[PDB]
């Protein structure tokens, strides 16, 4: 198993083709589980399926630029469940990131950092545990 937070670096960045694979399992009682692309201090891609949002399930997605939040991306579909092992699959793709939950389309994220090569690092974060967190060229 990982430790969570974890750190994966994506050295020099990320470039289309690049596929991203998260394994692990949901606690149970889960509240909210984050995936962070990183350029240095800003977050350009922050993924975070939320288990209780006035109780209700979504995945709220954003870009962190200057310490600052912009306008948040959601999406209805929830494919976690507490307690269940998951797979995430992001695939850099050349106008947005992909994003695959157990093998099932789930969204797609426009790039608003546009310096692919300098988004540098993928931290995971959240109630999750953590059993892999790898990157090949597909
Ligand atoms: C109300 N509000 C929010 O809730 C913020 O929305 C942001 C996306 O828009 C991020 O999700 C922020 N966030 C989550 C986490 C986190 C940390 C962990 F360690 C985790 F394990 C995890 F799962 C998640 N860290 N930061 C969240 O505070 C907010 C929205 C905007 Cl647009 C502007 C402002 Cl000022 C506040």
């Known amino acids: 198993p990982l430790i969570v937070p974890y750190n994966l670096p994506l050295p020099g960045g990320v470039v289309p083709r690049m596929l991203i ?3 692990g399992t ?3 009682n889960a509240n909210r589980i984050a ?7 800003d ?30 991306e959601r999406q209805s579909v929830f494919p976690f469940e507490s307690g269940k092992p998951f797979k995430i ?7 947005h990131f992909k994003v695959a939950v157990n093998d099932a389309h789930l ?23 953590l059993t892999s967190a790898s990157y090949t060229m597909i």
Do not use: M
């Not at 995936?35 to 201090?41: A, H, P, T």
């Not at 699959?89 to 106008?95: G, K």
């Open 21 to 23: 694979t998260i394994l």
């Open 26 to 28: 949901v606690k149970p």
């Open 35 to 41: 995936l962070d692309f990183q350029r240095g201090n």
């Open 43 to 72: 977050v350009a891609f922050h993924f975070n399926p939320r288990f209780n949002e006035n109780n209700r399930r979504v995945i709220v997605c954003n870009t962190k630029l200057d310490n600052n939040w912009g306008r948040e």
């Open 89 to 95: 699959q992001v695939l850099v793709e050349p106008d």
């Open 107 to 129: 969204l797609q994220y426009n790039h608003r950092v546009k310096k692919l090569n300098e988004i540098s690092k993928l931290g995971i974060s959240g109630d999750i545990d």
